[PDB]
């Protein structure tokens, strides 16, 4: 995963936007750096993470389509996030 990916510009779909709005200011266009931080912050503030995030109990699970995932499998995380946004 190249660092340049963090600079890419994206627009979250409605359910992802709902999640992001609980940790950051609403924007019409975000960088992937922003999306990753806000999602990460959401997970930490809600203590869904202690390397496993448990989200069967949360909107995040509905967004990702999984009951849990590892914080270390970055490829899979990127793929899960991208189902929930549109590139601009």
Ligand X SMILES: CC(C)(C)S(=O)(=O)C[C@H](C1CC1)N1C(=O)[C@@H](CC(=O)O)O[C@H](c2cccc(Cl)c2)[C@H]1c1ccc(Cl)cc1
Residue 51 CB, nearest approach to ligand X (Å): 7
- List binders of ligand X among 47-86 (CB under 6 A): 49, 53, 71-72, 74, 77-78
- Is the CA virtual torsion 60, 39, 72, 87 positive or negative? positive
Least Å distance between CB 78 and ligand X? Answer: 5
Q: What's the CA gap between 87 and 30, in Å, rounded?
A: 10
Does 36 participate in binding ligand X (rule CB under 6 A)?
A: yes
Q: Which of 17, 21, 24, 40 binds ligand X (CB under 6 A)?
A: 40
- Give the N- to C-terminal CA distance of the chain in Å, as an integer: 19
Report the C-alpha gap between 59 and 87 in whole angstroms.
22
Instruction: Return the number of the residue (28 or 47) whose C-beta is nearest ligand X.
Output: 47
Q: Give the HSE-up count for residue 57: Cα atoms under 13 Å, Cβ half-sphere.
A: 7
Residues forming contacts to ligand X in the complex (CB under 6 A) are 36-37, 39-41, 43-44, 49, 53, 71-72, 74, 77-78
């Amino acid at each position: 995963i190249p660092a340049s990916e963090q600079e890419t510009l994206v627009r979250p779909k409605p359910l992802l936007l709902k999640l992001l709005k609980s940790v950051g200011a609403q924007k019409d266009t975000y960088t992937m750096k922003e999306v990753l931080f806000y999602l990460g912050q959401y997970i930490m503030t809600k203590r869904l993470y202690d390397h496993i995030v448990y989200c069967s109990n949360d909107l995040l699970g509905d967004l990702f389509g999984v009951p849990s995932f590892s914080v270390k499998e970055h490829r899979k995380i990127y793929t899960m996030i991208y189902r929930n946004l549109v590139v601009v």
